[PDB]
Write a protein that binds this DNA or RNA. Sequence first.
DNA 1: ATCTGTACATGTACAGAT
DNA 2: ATCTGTACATGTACAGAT
DNA 3: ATCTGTACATGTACAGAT
DNA 4: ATCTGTACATGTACAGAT
Lengths: 340, 344
Amino acid sequence: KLKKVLDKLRLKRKDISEAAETVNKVVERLLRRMQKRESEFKGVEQLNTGSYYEHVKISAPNQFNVMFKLEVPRIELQEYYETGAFYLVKFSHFLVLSATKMLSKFRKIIKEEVKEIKDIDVSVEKEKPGSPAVTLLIRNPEEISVDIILALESKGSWPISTKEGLPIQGWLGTKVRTNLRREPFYLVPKNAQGETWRLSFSHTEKYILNNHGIEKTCCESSGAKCCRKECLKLMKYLLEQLKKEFQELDAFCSYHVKTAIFHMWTQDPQDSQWDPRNLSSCFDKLLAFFLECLRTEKLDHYFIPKFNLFSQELIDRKSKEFLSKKIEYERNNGFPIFDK
Amino acid sequence: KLKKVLDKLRLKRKDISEAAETVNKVVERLLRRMQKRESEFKGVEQLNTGSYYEHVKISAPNQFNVMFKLEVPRIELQEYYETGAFYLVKPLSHFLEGEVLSATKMLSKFRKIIKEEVKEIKDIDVSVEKEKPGSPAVTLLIRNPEEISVDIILALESKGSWPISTKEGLPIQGWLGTKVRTNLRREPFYLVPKNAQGETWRLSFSHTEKYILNNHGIEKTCCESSGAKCCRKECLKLMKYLLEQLKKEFQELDAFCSYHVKTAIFHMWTQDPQDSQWDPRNLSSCFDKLLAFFLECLRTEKLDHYFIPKFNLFSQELIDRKSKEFLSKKIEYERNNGFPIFDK
DNA sequence: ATCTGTACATGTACAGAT
DNA sequence: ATCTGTACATGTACAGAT
DNA sequence: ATCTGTACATGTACAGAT
DNA sequence: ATCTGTACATGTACAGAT
Ligand SMILES: Nc1nc2c(ncn2[C@@H]2O[C@H](COP(=O)(O)OP(=O)(O)OP(=O)(O)O)[C@@H](O)[C@H]2OP(=O)(O)OC[C@H]2O[C@@H](n3cnc4c(N)ncnc43)[C@H](O)[C@@H]2O)c(=O)[nH]1
Ligand SMILES: Nc1nc2c(ncn2[C@@H]2O[C@H](COP(=O)(O)OP(=O)(O)OP(=O)(O)O)[C@@H](O)[C@H]2OP(=O)(O)OC[C@H]2O[C@@H](n3cnc4c(N)ncnc43)[C@H](O)[C@@H]2O)c(=O)[nH]1
Ligand SMILES: [Mn+2]
Ligand SMILES: [Mn+2]
Ligand SMILES: [Zn+2]
Ligand SMILES: [Zn+2]
């Protein structure tokens, strides 16, 4: 049933190999150019993030997220109008440290370097306003897009917006939380305007995805398999499928599904609440949770509790009612959309 | 019953504070002296180990273990006659016998230095205990107002893969897991100057044992503020106390030490990995099953090093059958007569 | 003026004290 | 149940070195 | 400051056992 | 149909060399 769906979604070893080899070529070349050229980004380091590197990528290895992170000295942040997630930055050519001005130069560089690649078919997608990414389109023989995300790395204690965030205490525990919060935090040039950066915990999300159990042995070779990741895949696929069919759902993205499942994993911390034999119940309880988020217009950022991704501002009630009717439908008709 | 015993064993905060303040003073002073620009041990670093820093020290804060670890570059190791635990090693250049780095020569110089430095401390009453042959420690006796001993253990740090003797060691896969194991085995390993002759060093995983003690659960929340308390450490304390009590009364038990009880409990924690097999409401069963395990080790003359499987701490060399029979009858007795020795 | 090994500043888990 | 001392990990300030 | 080598976790593909 | 065991593939951390 849903086992058969996960079979469909499962990536092919062959395709992983071919995608990776090409992506790594282009990324390595870009990374060397930021260093080898005596550029503004000299110290930059590679941090692979998102679904491919979390092993929750579905259908195809056709989308990759890579952070080019740059350790900067001390930087006083100032919260930008109480959102919790957006800040200005303060204290070489990009002055306040402007996101746009810095992203632009980052982009100019990438575009130059891509233009001198004749070993593989790779263009740079037109820029999306207030996206932090520079997006590459590889044609390979098949379509693969890579988001290259500039990131400022800060070693200070995390912002206060995140104090009550990351509520993993009853699940992954207090030591894990304290350790995670000793890791640096990241700022990416996603604008809200043009000088605003945004907090990133892609590194933390990646740790969580690969260390998701209350038992240390969850999903290891001498432990028991859970169905936590499988539920994430199924949920993402339901959203992808709906999204490709209904333009009404443009406001929604997979980060919403990811955020909600982090909350469900917190609410139901036991590995035995995610037994593979109960995949149907688990997926269903996840759907029930997501619908409650829509109904109540409430889905708090997992790291920044005061930041509501389902506020009226970001997403219209109509959009939410629309998605609810569509989820309710698929749920009460045996998920016919999984058959396209 | 055993709850009341653990109450007795529990350290006083007041005593911890007074012990710690003095110990830290002496250790800091020693550590700074080793940094002397002309010291063979320049770049030595401090690593606190053993029961006090594992929170399984019982009765009093009267014994502390500290490693002074020194990173050395590449060093070929040669296993010393298939023991698994002992090896030869290959400015620092003044303790070398041809290719070989001498334990005793290096320990001696380490000791000469410590003794000098302690003799210039008039702040507090501290002497250096007579040397015990084939101990890696330089042992300080602080009189404070009360008796506290500190073992300062010289250690060579290597960052290479651990020795093969340890490949099948540390069988935590069903308990703490494969990631924890892989990570732990990326940590450096240590060599201390315990001889078996005079140039032989011995493997140390005191750092690893410390991690395990403080991260002892299958659940990440074991013993945390939003988790469930187990009785794993409490069992360790009770077992150590049974041995300490017997040891101080019967000279026949000189061959035995607390490392034996620690090693056995690591095995029990592996055999019974679930936190629910160490529920506080089952402290009696848990302690008893640990005793039953230890008795089987004695009767069959077998207690494998947890990190070095081929190294039997209860071989018929090292420990006489007599010693083992003697300890067995004593444990069996205490067990079947309500632990009267807990009342002394 | 610039760089740095040492010490301090900060934060929290663990466990004893209350 | 709440409060508090120690240990330990990480970040940063700076007198002494360069 | 950069690269390779090693080890093993997380995957997938497929056959034989259940 | 599902589980187990092996092979084959990629990602990632860290050490030692350069
Ligand atoms: N990562 C991330 N995404 C979002 C955040 N808020 C909103 N989003 C949007 O959700 C999707 C997620 O795409 P993805 O990151 O590739 O997702 P996964 O890899 O987990 O899963 P899969 O690829 O669906 O299988 C996307 O539409 C996001 O839109 P934008 O915000 O425009 O992101 C574009 C681009 O920028 C990256 N990015 C945005 N914000 C980021 C932060 N804070 N850190 C790191 N990268 C970030 C994004 O990865 C994408 O490449 C959100 O907070 N985080
Ligand atoms: N640590 C350790 N000890 C031993 C090993 N084999 C045998 N032993 C002997 O067991 C006891 C343990 O004393 P401890 O280290 O203080 O124990 P705890 O702190 O866990 O418990 P508590 O203090 O009883 O509450 C001791 O008699 C050991 O005797 P020796 O082997 O002669 O050493 C005495 C001295 O040397 C230290 N030491 C020995 N080997 C060491 C290694 N490999 N690393 C670090 N220190 C080592 C010992 O700590 C003590 O100070 C064994 O493998 N490990
Ligand atoms: Mn992605
Ligand atoms: Mn000790
Ligand atoms: Zn799992
Ligand atoms: Zn516990």
